[PDB]
Design an enzyme around this catalytic site. Structure first.
Site, PDB file in Angstrom:
ATOM      1  CG  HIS A  57      80.458  93.192  41.185  1.00 52.33           C
ATOM      2  ND1 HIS A  57      80.547  94.470  41.777  1.00 52.33           N
ATOM      3  CD2 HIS A  57      80.445  92.491  42.099  1.00 52.33           C
ATOM      4  CE1 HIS A  57      80.260  94.404  43.030  1.00 52.33           C
ATOM      5  NE2 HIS A  57      80.335  92.931  43.384  1.00 52.33           N
ATOM      6  CG  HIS A 105      84.099  89.241  41.523  1.00 52.00           C
ATOM      7  ND1 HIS A 105      84.789  89.049  42.751  1.00 52.00           N
ATOM      8  CD2 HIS A 105      82.703  88.996  41.865  1.00 52.00           C
ATOM      9  CE1 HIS A 105      83.775  88.992  43.614  1.00 52.00           C
ATOM     10  NE2 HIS A 105      82.627  88.948  43.061  1.00 52.00           N
ATOM     11  CG  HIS A 146      79.002  85.013  43.232  1.00 50.69           C
ATOM     12  ND1 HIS A 146      80.320  85.148  42.568  1.00 50.69           N
ATOM     13  CD2 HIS A 146      79.159  86.254  43.919  1.00 50.69           C
ATOM     14  CE1 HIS A 146      80.939  85.930  42.662  1.00 50.69           C
ATOM     15  NE2 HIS A 146      80.443  86.818  43.509  1.00 50.69           N
ATOM     16  CG  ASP A 147      78.614  89.178  41.826  1.00 46.76           C
ATOM     17  OD1 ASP A 147      77.617  89.334  42.518  1.00 46.76           O
ATOM     18  OD2 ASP A 147      79.774  88.909  42.492  1.00 46.76           O
TER      19      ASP A 147
HETATM   20  C1  LIG Z   1      81.233  95.014  46.314  1.00 38.48           C
HETATM   21  C2  LIG Z   1      80.747  94.237  47.241  1.00 38.48           C
HETATM   22  C3  LIG Z   1      81.754  93.309  48.038  1.00 38.48           C
HETATM   23  N1  LIG Z   1      82.636  94.081  48.747  1.00 38.48           N
HETATM   24  C4  LIG Z   1      83.925  94.235  48.343  1.00 38.48           C
HETATM   25  O1  LIG Z   1      84.554  93.038  48.156  1.00 38.48           O
HETATM   26  C5  LIG Z   1      85.019  95.013  49.031  1.00 38.48           C
HETATM   27  C6  LIG Z   1      86.077  94.763  49.122  1.00 38.48           C
HETATM   28  N2  LIG Z   1      86.779  96.025  49.874  1.00 38.48           N
HETATM   29  N3  LIG Z   1      85.775  96.883  50.240  1.00 38.48           N
HETATM   30  C7  LIG Z   1      85.735  97.953  50.907  1.00 38.48           C
HETATM   31  C8  LIG Z   1      84.515  98.664  50.942  1.00 38.48           C
HETATM   32  C9  LIG Z   1      84.470  99.827  51.693  1.00 38.48           C
HETATM   33  C10 LIG Z   1      83.323  97.808  50.613  1.00 38.48           C
HETATM   34  N4  LIG Z   1      83.309  96.843  50.117  1.00 38.48           N
HETATM   35  C11 LIG Z   1      84.519  96.234  49.688  1.00 38.48           C
HETATM   36  C12 LIG Z   1      81.001  92.427  49.038  1.00 38.48           C
HETATM   37  C13 LIG Z   1      80.450  91.303  48.774  1.00 38.48           C
HETATM   38  C14 LIG Z   1      79.757  90.423  49.541  1.00 38.48           C
HETATM   39  C15 LIG Z   1      79.544  90.906  50.956  1.00 38.48           C
HETATM   40  O2  LIG Z   1      78.919  90.066  51.875  1.00 38.48           O
HETATM   41  C16 LIG Z   1      79.734  89.180  52.442  1.00 38.48           C
HETATM   42  F1  LIG Z   1      80.697  89.804  53.208  1.00 38.48           F
HETATM   43  F2  LIG Z   1      79.119  88.440  53.264  1.00 38.48           F
HETATM   44  F3  LIG Z   1      80.685  88.303  51.712  1.00 38.48           F
HETATM   45  C17 LIG Z   1      80.111  91.878  51.197  1.00 38.48           C
HETATM   46  C18 LIG Z   1      80.695  92.843  50.252  1.00 38.48           C
HETATM   47 MG   LIG Z   2      77.270  90.041  44.275  1.00 37.75          MG
HETATM   48 ZN   LIG Z   3      80.798  88.565  44.095  1.00 34.72          ZN
END
Ligand SMILES: CC[C@@H](NC(=O)c1cnn2cc(C)cnc12)c1ccc(OC(F)(F)F)cc1
Ligand SMILES: [Mg+2]
Ligand SMILES: [Zn+2]
Ligand SMILES: CC[C@@H](NC(=O)c1cnn2cc(C)cnc12)c1ccc(OC(F)(F)F)cc1
Ligand SMILES: [Mg+2]
Ligand SMILES: [Mg+2]
Ligand SMILES: [Zn+2]
EC number: 3.1.4.17
Lengths: 340, 319
Positions: free
Chosen positions: A78, A82, A118-119
């Site tokens: 993050h 990103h 956003h982050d």
């Molecule tokens: C770090 C948060 C981010 N996760 C990823 O990018 C991510 C990539 N591979 N991965 C594998 C696992 C097990 C978990 N998370 C991820 C995220 C951001 C927004 C969100 O909300 C939305 F889906 F609605 F966008 C959901 C997840």
């Molecule tokens: Mg975020």
């Molecule tokens: Zn993000």
């Protein structure tokens, strides 16, 4: 100041001068050096004509972009890169799905600025960890929900109120409020919890079709588009999804370590002793990422290749799963780990 | 020559781990065990000759991860435990027990960290075991090192025949061939007047000595597995470099340790200690410790899956 002169004297450049493949879904924004990202932001805003459309003062815009960039910390995932890559994908959606035929100019503009912001000030930990650790952000936002997302927004506002950084200070009173509302809604849509709450609304809208005269559809689409951008690292090639997995799991296990150090038992994906990456990746792909791009596909036929790439990447995770089985001795030549 | 109790109060116990004893004290410990079994006085062994013989044997081992002096020492120490705990004099002649101990010391001499299959890629099997014995003969034929130089012509040849047989019994193929004969003997009960029973028991005792690391606690079996796999994969690496496909269990990229450890534990090691238990009720604790270690191995099998990121922080190995 130092970077300000560098950025300003570079001048807003045609998107072609960055790369010929820049507006393509195949392009990987992370291939661009970090020292070129701020110019690329300006280039993208120019290409979408938001600078001339809204008559944004270019030095104010330069300062804004540098402040946003500075407003990110450096955890493994993050960080600014990103936010930049998310912003780039928003630009890709604009160019490839022709968003002007679906949303107001002010909405697309708010989507892109939101992506940048956003982050903001992310510390590499989720909403849960803020409460557990009793951070200032939890004190501020825990009763409202979406702790981090509310902080990101608050940070974006603070940047706008920094002298010389208000890119909307010439906006009409009506447009100014609209922009602030849009940014808040869009940034809050980045909480997975929110996505999961509106998921059935999104399923309804995709099935019945997008109605441009429906104000609720505008809101829902903006949310879906924002989540698509946020997860866009899953729509590229194998190299990208794999490198990103490194960064995300690095971040996750860092948080897990801190949870163990304060007494708590972290969730499976945060626990470096119990987390099986293939399984966690696939579950995320199939149940979070893939449906987002399936919905996008159903609304925009030109988004089909995005869903197919996420599906392909998910199959690749299945294919390489077997390699998480220790063959021979570990890359250590010890079996001491058998007594944990 | 130091008395056994002065080395350790638990030295004559099955719970004792001879690998805990510093390598510099091992030669001295050999003389102590031989003293305690009374073979020095029994066979009028010249002590300086015995001292020199022990050092030549110790020196006759190379330094692979597993098949080094410490293996031979621990094997020899287990033979002493069998003597001290099971009362082998009820089953075997003094010369047979003496031959067994010396054979334990000599049984893997000049081991290179490679197996018989490596010699293949002279074809009657047991190539290395035959080499080990020749090396023992070569040490005896070394001036000032023949501990049997004063034996009668009959006793000399008898001693050499016993050593060859006992050393040849260390080959897995030999053990599998005689397994039925071992089972029959255990089934009908040991007959001391039966010459064939003596020969079979000696073969069983030797294999039980050879695999004695599996009869201790978790620490020993885990440490020994390290050393053994380290050795097996180095042979695999060598065979790859010379231009041959190594066997699956020798290939560090193909071999799965849990599946190999357990297979060895239950199919090879455990039936040996089961047969030992059948002939010697006092050897019951040995089979139990092997079964427990076998059970512990199945417990830790899950750990051979990578949780979290690997040693570093990269998923580079996936590409
Ligand atoms: C770090 C948060 C981010 N996760 C990823 O990018 C991510 C990539 N591979 N991965 C594998 C696992 C097990 C978990 N998370 C991820 C995220 C951001 C927004 C969100 O909300 C939305 F889906 F609605 F966008 C959901 C997840
Ligand atoms: Mg975020
Ligand atoms: Zn993000
Ligand atoms: C190095 C040979 C030695 N093996 C071990 O000690 C050993 C320990 N863990 N382990 C795990 C595997 C997969 C394989 N081998 C081992 C051996 C010696 C004699 C013998 O013949 C007999 F069975 F008759 F004794 C059979 C095997
Ligand atoms: Mg429909
Ligand atoms: Mg051998
Ligand atoms: Zn051996």
């Amino acid at each position: 100041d130092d970077e300000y002169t560098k950025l300003l004297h570079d001048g807003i450049q045609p998107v072609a001068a960055i790369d010929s493949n820049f507006a393509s879904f195949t392009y990987t924004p992370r291939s661009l050096p970090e020292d070129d990202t701020s110019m690329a932001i300006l280039s993208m805003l120019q290409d979408m004509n938001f600078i001339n459309n809204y008559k944004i003062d270019c030095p104010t815009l330069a300062r804004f972009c540098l402040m946003v960039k500075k407003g990110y910390r450096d955890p493994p995932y993050h960080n600014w890169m990103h936010a930049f890559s998310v912003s780039h994908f928003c630009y890709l959606l604009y160019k490839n799905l022709e968003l002007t035929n679906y949303l107001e100019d002010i909405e697309i503009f708010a989507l892109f600025i939101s992506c940048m912001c956003h982050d903001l000030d992310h510390r590499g930990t989720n909403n849960s960890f803020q409460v557990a650790s009793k951070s200032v952000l939890a004190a501020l936002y825990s009763s409202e929900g979406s702790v981090m997302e509310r902080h990101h927004f608050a940070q974006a506002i603070a940047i706008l109120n920094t002298h010389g950084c208000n890119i909307f200070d010439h906006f009409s009173r009506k447009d100014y409020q609209r922009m602030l509302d849009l940014m808040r809604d869009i940034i809050l849509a980045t909480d997975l919890a929110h996505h999961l709450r509106i998921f059935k609304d999104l399923q309804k809208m995709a099935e019945v079709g997008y109605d441009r005269n429906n104000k609720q559809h505008h809101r829902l689409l903006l949310c879906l588009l924002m989540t698509s951008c946020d997860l866009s690292d899953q729509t590229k090639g194998w190299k990208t999804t794999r490198k990103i997995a490194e960064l995300i799991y690095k971040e996750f296990f860092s948080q897990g370590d801190l949870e163990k150090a304060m007494g708590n038992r972290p969730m499976e994906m945060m626990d470096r002793e119990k987390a099986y990456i293939p399984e966690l990746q696939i579950s995320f792909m199939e149940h979070i990422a893939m449906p987002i791009y399936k919905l996008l596909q159903d609304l925009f036929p030109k988004a089909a290749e995005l869903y197919e790439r996420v599906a392909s990447n998910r199959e690749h995770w299945t294919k390489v799963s077997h390699k998480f089985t220790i063959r021979g001795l570990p890359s250590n030549n010890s079996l001491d780990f058998l007594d944990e």
